[PDB]
Amino acid sequence: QVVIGPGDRPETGLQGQTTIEDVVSGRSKLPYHAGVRLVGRTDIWNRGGNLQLSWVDQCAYVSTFKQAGPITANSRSALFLREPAGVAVIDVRDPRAPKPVRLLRDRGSIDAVETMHAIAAPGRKVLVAGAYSGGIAGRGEEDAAWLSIYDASNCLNPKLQSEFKWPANIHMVTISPNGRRVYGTEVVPGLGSGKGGLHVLDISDMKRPRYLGRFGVTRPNGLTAGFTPHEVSISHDERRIYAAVLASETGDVPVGASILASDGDVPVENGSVYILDNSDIVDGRSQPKMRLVGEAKQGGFHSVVPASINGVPHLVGAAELGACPGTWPRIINIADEKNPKIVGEFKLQMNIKENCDAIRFTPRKEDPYASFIPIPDITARLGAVGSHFNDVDDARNTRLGLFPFFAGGVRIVDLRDPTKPVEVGYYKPGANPDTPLSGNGLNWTGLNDQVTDGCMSHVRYVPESGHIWFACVTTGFHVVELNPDLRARLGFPT
């Protein structure tokens, strides 16, 4: 429950809503927030087009995504890939004043979109960024699925070690805890057919990457089939891979509407979460083998991450975006990994269909053009309110969900009762119109950059300071923190 206080600038409509009233008046261009305060912010050379966030030490890395389109060839998108496109390196040594220092514009980093990860490991700090658009069949080598691999030993100045070409389009990457392997998901072109897999690259020698292969899922029946995971997270000892999965080649997982549509509704499906035994790779066994340990149907197809709630291991998964009522995270008990169980969900008021209808300017039953000339309601011209990543504060001691909801901003959720997650705060960053990467009315995401903004990045929590890092599309990189009152109340130290 959000208890609104003196510092707060609360939502003026339904929970999760950007009101047309605020859009017309200009109010929507300023931030809305409850339970939090802003520590620092940078618009990253006022560039727009920001997507993913990764980090090493006190450095933030923020990717960009081109307006030309998610799988459009980079070779045809030169008009959209000039500076300031690229992975921005941000100095957060003073979180009051995060400062963009440089731009990484190599084959993988110039248009990384969601494909970027970094990790600090023993003797190794590594940032990788890949061409999200790369490797579509029939294109030239310039448009291949490049992965730029950087030594981030000095996080302010990552050094290109090599550029590897995947033999397929890779959608999202996750570096192993030891920093020696990159796991890259393949969702294209298979998509709903489930004909894809999980690729693994050995980067033990960062200058000589060694491809290990493309893995399907091996079930207790002894059979191996493709799947289309969007992202994976990895257990501390690398023996478990938690995958957010769109579909399985077995046909096991139902597939639904476009996450970027508006009517027809037609729900977007949640997909499935896989718990995968990865011990073969960890122990260097020949012909590995990712074995299905357990499955949570409806677990979330876009991102799944580990959590520990009151000492009980959990996962938080979600689909992404979607026309109202959108998509939202589910809380998954995995105390018995062979039998994961959804025990809770976090929904905003704008994730209830009755509410989507109620706010419409034109009731659907009154629209004679509904089939003949479909026209989205004016309320559908702002941006989806639904998940785009779904992180937690601390995998080892979870209290908070840190949930980007795209146009709904970042939602701060008390997860201490996994069966009943409740919002305790939020931050909607306002608007930043006319940036070079999000302007000119050329967006494809549905986000109205004229009047609002969306947050799409992974979220960091720094336990020693209580700081929370995230990026939003036009408004850039933010450091926020919980109000001291709310923080003390929630069980946090300091």
Is 302 one of the annotated binding-site residues? yes
Is 467 one of the annotated binding-site residues? no
Q: Is 119 in the site for its own copies (CB under 8 A)?
A: no
The nearest distance, CB 451 to its own copies, in angstroms, is 5
The nearest distance, CB 419 to its own copies, in angstroms, is 33
Residues near 82 by Cβ (< 8 Å), separated by ≥ 6? Answer: none
Q: Is 261 in the site for its own copies (CB under 8 A)?
A: yes
- The residue range among 33-41, 71-79, 94-102, 419-427 that interacts with its own copies, by the rule CB under 8 A, is 71-79
Q: Is 17 in the site for its own copies (CB under 8 A)?
A: no
281 contacts 212 by C-beta, under 8 angstroms: yes
Q: Which segments of 219-327 does DSSP mark as H helices, in order?
A: 279-282
Q: Is 192 in the site for its own copies (CB under 8 A)?
A: yes
- The residue range among 15-23, 100-108, 276-284, 419-427 that interacts with its own copies, by the rule CB under 8 A, is 15-23
One of 311, 365, 396, 494 touching its own copies (CB under 8 A): 365
- The residue range among 305-313, 326-334, 421-429, 433-441 that interacts with its own copies, by the rule CB under 8 A, is 433-441
Q: Which is nearer to its own copies, 58 or 362 (CB)?
A: 362
One of 439, 466, 467, 492 touching its own copies (CB under 8 A): 439
Give the pairing of strands 227-234 and 410-414. unpaired
Instruction: State the residue for tokens 């979180």.
Output: 95
Q: Is 23 in the site for its own copies (CB under 8 A)?
A: yes
* 92 burial type by CB count under 10 A (0-12 exposed, 13-18 middle, 19+ buried): buried
351 contacts 326 by C-beta, under 8 angstroms: yes
87 contacts 104 by C-beta, under 8 angstroms: yes
One of 1, 122, 123, 137 touching its own copies (CB under 8 A): 137
3-state DSSP assignment of residue 485: helix
Instruction: Give CA–CA dist 310/246, Å, rounded.
Output: 30
Q: Which is nearer to its own copies, 305 or 324 (CB)?
A: 324
Please confirm whether the linkage preceding 306 is cis (ω < 30° from 0).
Answer: no
Is 236 one of the annotated binding-site residues? no
- The residue range among 3-11, 72-80, 122-130, 422-430 that interacts with its own copies, by the rule CB under 8 A, is 72-80
Q: Which segments of 299-416 does DSSP mark as H helices, in order?
A: 353-358
Q: Is 381 in the site for its own copies (CB under 8 A)?
A: yes
DSSP for 97-154, please give it.
Answer: S-EEEEEE-STTTTT-TT-EEEEEETTEEEEEEE-TTTT-TT--GGGSEEEEEEE-SS
The nearest distance, CB 66 to its own copies, in angstroms, is 9
* Number of neighbours of residue 99 by Cβ within 10 angstroms: 15
Instruction: State the residue for tokens 């020696």.
Output: 180
> What residues are designated binding site?
114, 171, 230, 302, 320, 388
> What residues are designated binding site for Mn(2+)?
114, 171, 230, 302, 320, 388
> Given the rule CB under 8 A, which residues bind its own copies?
20-21, 23-24, 67-73, 76-77, 79-80, 136-139, 188-189, 191-192, 255, 258-261, 361-362, 365-369, 372-378, 381, 439-442, 444, 448-451
